[PDB]
């Protein structure tokens, strides 16, 4: 009956409720450090000169 | 009876909500307002690729940043050269109701599928000079909504019968089935290390799946309607979604929360496509009011607008080195922006 | 994949013949075709060209007004018509496949040839070696030179390497200088810059004995080098 | 020669500032809402052929009868090849919308597979390259330096561009009538009664503007002339300013496409 | 010119691909594209059989004209996610069985599905051919069961010819798009080729009346 799908959904939420989490301050400060370390390598953020841009004509 | 389910479900929903709310120290808008603004971004149309005769539903860049592939509602699949605007191949299809395409990572195969419930594989490197079929993969009971390769022998699909799947191309049989959504599944996106993938469906919920263990691991809620597009951050530890709610959102895999929302009052139509840039600073969202916007991903301001089509923009993709941006639309034109 | 061709024979000077080849499966209607030629105990030489769709047709300045080429496309057959033969036309004749798009590999299948014995501004390639002796197991280097730079403004260098075992047809090895063909062992390699190019072999086996040729494909009248022979 | 009147030549100035300044102010607003589909080029090449031909004509006709001016065989005919090629480029454009609206009923299955932009953008480039090859063409009674054997050549061509307009709207009003019987009687008197009140208004404005002034021109070839015919050709030539204002009342305003596009601006 | 000998042959290839991609595009400006709907009764079985896993396509010819017909009943998923693929078909074919007025649960269900497709935002200018099946079995049940089981507000006779004429007024009163689109009812005379010639007339009516809007004449 529906007693099988009742016990199946409880076992899913049991596995998910005990996973470990960190503070949201450290998870937000790590997203800035990737964008600052790669700002030189992004061509859409700082436009390159027309010599090495291969879509000039 | 079934009433003994009710205390188990209600306590675990209350336990997860108390666990997420405890670790919310400060928002992303609070720590980032000391950073400098992006300024103003103005981009222009460098190429215009013509030759389709109907609406365009899918597009995918190759991995050498020069070739791409596209599919329309005519029975055609065309491989382009983006520097010289030349055509390399043109492939006739068996069914005309096409909604997906994907390019192989080795540049060796290409895949396609739609309302005929089948994903088909094509071979570009034969000994006779023709593109042929190699496999046809059957077993879904609903329209295919997306497809992505892992290598030359494994492919992950997605259909509208609430079910994702992992295949083997050499034998033909599916080896893992991913169940747990209650609505039709619309999109997926792999990870950079190629071990996990996210998926978004009509439940207004998105799930994180494990490829090798074959089970769900986390679930994210917060939208108010169907999710049409999803994309993975280049670090590997965030993603962004796109809905008919007219709102993009940014989620986290290590804090299990929402970080920021990208909304504005003058937008009332829904998002079709979502992609990031190379440094992960820009967020490009194709909309339904005929244009595309550009968002600063760290401060939720908008930076630019890309307007070139009479009709709905249905697909977009940013290249692997970071030069160009492609878009496709229902007025049958591809445009490369730079 | 096959190209099978026939004709030839003994011709009094001033006569006429035609030559013909056949294709098998092969998707014949997407490949441009050539006719390449070699004399007895001499090097290779290029003759004619007919494109896909029978559009662009080119010739050599030696055969401009005597030879004409045509394609019979639904029957999978290629033609070459001869008029007013001379003594310089005693040679072999080879039908050669090619495809031109981004990433392809031209000049990759030769036919088996057909004998013909009659009765009795250009880029110049050169290579000086002739019948060098090589002990097996050791590395060899073969080089040819050009009178003009083959590097183009788009980045490509158009030099192609061939191999011809005795009694066989030629075979593609290096189709553009840093790229090797399919079916070829990984011990072969090739490098060079500007107007100086060289081939290299890592570990010589018993089957690499034969002649070698280098060809340019930058400006159109195609020129082969002379014959460099390996012997044991 | 230039004889009309000393007092009755003082109201055409009060008439041609209000029958020519509307057809400049109307054929410009039509081009301010054009959006474009490949059968709106043929409306374009009569919306601009009645803008050039209704300032050059208004300035030249006010130059000659009222306050006077003289010229010679090069200053004058520079303006007589510049009112001819702007009226035979306004009859060639009425002839193209009646060769287009005839392949929309005679072969309805095959109509979007014939009238395409490769055969409809070059198509008005051979009416502006034959209308300016028959108005420079004089290299060499009422018109000064034009021989009598040339007006029998302009009329002999402009007539048969008015006998495929009183024929290509009497095969729409017949084929779309016998069709309206078959699909009401069995099929499920409403169709050819909404095509018989915007197809009669066209042929009652085209026969009372190219019918008086192409009739007085026959009086010069076919015999003699008199005085009071010269004093009335100056008002009968003001019919050409009438068939320039009403054409954006009959063609461009009589649609729902150009009246849906009118609302959101 | 500044092109190599390879790069000059990679544009002759791309111009022979467009010359076949165009020649398969006026080849499909000849054919008529029809969608089919209705609830999953046996009414679809008669219509497909008489005109000679996700999408099923049927093609047939009648007086030198080519039709293609698309059955989309085998999907059983969310309809609002693939129904914009059919924007641009010529006419929609609907199917209703007359005799199911008492099994009043079924007849209201067909009125719910007719009302949703007639007023979509994707089908503002599409004609609806409407078939009505089981006319022979309908006069048998009406002699035993009155029409007031299905429609309580029926003040009519409950004879045969006055009841079947009350069904056509109910489907055609649901149209809120009176100034753009039209419905052509025809009772399914299942004996002859009259089924396909009504439908031959219904598409010549809509092609002619579409060309008289492209030239701006209406
Ligand atoms: C005697 O003339 C005139 O003073 C004027 C005012 N022009 C007319 O009076 C006039 C009035 C009409 C209706 N047309 C007409 C139209 C089409 C073709 C021809 C022709 F000459 F080629 F046969 C003539 N010209 C002109 C002044 C400068 C150039 S003309």
Residue numbers in the entry:
A (entry chain C): 7 to 63
B (entry chain B): 3 to 340
C (entry chain S): 2 to 121, 124 to 235
D (entry chain R): 108 to 141, 148 to 253, 266 to 313, 335 to 411
E (entry chain A): 3 to 54, 182 to 232, 240 to 354
Publication excerpt:
The cannabinoid-1 and -2 receptors (CB1R and CB2R), both members of the lipid family of G protein coupled receptors (GPCRs), are the primary mediators of cannabinoid activity. Based on these expression profiles, and supported by animal studies, CB1R is thought to be the major target involved in the psychotropic and tetrad effects of cannabinoids, as well as their analgesic effects in tests of nociception, though because of the high similarity of the two receptors, and the peripheral distribution of CB2R, a role for the latter receptor often cannot be discounted without direct testing. The CB1R orthosteric site is large and lipophilic, explaining the high molecular weight and hydrophobicity of many of its ligands. In this work, we computationally dock a library of 74 million virtual but readily accessible molecules against human CB1R, revealing a range of different scaffolds with relatively favorable physical properties.
Structure-based optimization of one of the most potent of these (Ki = 0.7 µM) leads to ‘1350, a 0.95 nM ligand and a full CB1R agonist of Gi/o signaling. To understand the SAR of ‘1350 at atomic resolution, and to template future optimization, we determined the cryo-EM structure of the ‘1350-CB1R-Gi1 complex to a nominal resolution of 3.3 Å. Consistent with earlier structures of human CB1R in its activated state, the ligand occupies the orthosteric pocket formed by transmembrane helices (TMs) 2–3 and 5–7 and is capped by ECL 2. The experimental structure of ‘1350 superposes well on the docking-predicted pose of the R-enantiomer, which was the enantiomer with the better docking score to the receptor (-43 DOCK3.7 score versus -38 DOCK3.7 score for the S-enantiomer). The predicted and experimental structures superposed with an all-atom RMSD of 0.78 Å. Despite the local resolution limit that prevents unambiguously modelling all rotamers, the density suggests that major interactions with CB1R predicted by the docking are likely preserved in the experimental structure, including the key hydrogen-bond between the amide carbonyl of the ligand and S3837.39. The trifluoromethyl group is complemented by van der Waals and quadrupole interactions with residues W2795.43 and T1973.33, as anticipated by the docked structure, and consistent with the improvement in affinity by -1.7 kcal/mol (‘51486 Ki = 731 nM vs. ‘60154 Ki = 44 nM, 17-fold increased Ki from CF3 addition only) on its replacement of the original fluorine. Second, the pose adopted by ‘1350 in a cryo-EM structure of its complex with CB1R-Gi superposed closely on the docking prediction, explaining its SAR at atomic resolution and supporting future optimization. In CB1R, ‘1350 was approximately 2-fold more relatively efficacious at recruiting Gi/o and G13 subtypes than was CP-55,940, though the pattern of effectors recruited was similar.
